[PDB]
Structure formats: structure tokens, C-alpha cells
Amino acid sequence: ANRATSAFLDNPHPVGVNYVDEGSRQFVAVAELLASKLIDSSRESDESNS
Amino acid sequence: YPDADGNDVSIIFSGAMSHAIFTYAQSQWNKNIIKLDDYIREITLTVPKQ
Fold first, then answer.
1. Mutate to test the interface with B, among A46, A47, A49, A50 (most CBs of B within 10 A)
2. Which chain B residues are closer than 8 Å to A50 by Cβ?
3. How far apart are CA A27 and CA A1, in angstroms?
4. CA distances from B21 to A13, A24, B16 (A)
């Protein structure tokens, strides 16, 4: 018999066990909100002249 | 804020129809405002020598 397996499914390495508490999740969410404001502020500064 | 041409742009809270009517009348009157050198070039041929 022959066995064929999808390439990306083989041997998934373990993931980290840190930064998974409630406080760390807020930090990721806070970073996402402030990063999106960086892009919008850059566009707003372009549409204005300041 | 100022633009490239030197004009200053005002961004304010106003009505839609008040904005549309005011800005359209601004465009129509601006067609007759021309530079002094352009006006002279139009009336050079009519100027006598005396």
C-alpha cells in the first residue's frame, strides 16, 4: 500500500505558552487599535497640510 | 489649511444645500476674475498713441 499526505500537515511544531492571559490579550487588541490609527492619521495628515 | 496655490481651505460644519449653492456661485464669479496682465493683453489693440 501507498500513503500520501498533504505537505503542510506534517509535524506541526509546538506553539508558545506565554502571553495568553487576559492582560496579554488586551495588549494585542490595544496594539491593533493604535496601529490602525497610525494608518488613518497618516492619511489624514496627507489630506490636510499638517 | 493652505493649499499649493496659496489659497486657504476652511473645513466647517454646514448644510448641504447652503454648501452647494455657495460653492457654485463662487465658481461662476471666479470666471470673471483675471490677472491684470491678462486684462491688459486683451485691451492692447484698442489703445491709441496720443
1. A49
2. 1
3. 51
4. 66, 54, 9
State the smallest CA–CA distance between residue A44 and chain B in angstroms: 13
Alpha carbons B15 and A26: distance in angstroms, whole number: 41
Residue with cell 506565554: A18
- Residue for grid cell 506534517: A10
Resolution of the experimental structure, in angstroms: 2.6
| CA–centroid distance for B34 within its chain | 7
Distance CA A49, CA B1 (A): 6
| Interchain pair A48, B3: CB under 8 A | no
Cα A36 vs. chain centroid, distance in angstroms?
12
Q: B2 has which bridge partners?
A: B8
Q: Are B8 and A49 in contact (CB under 8 A)?
A: no
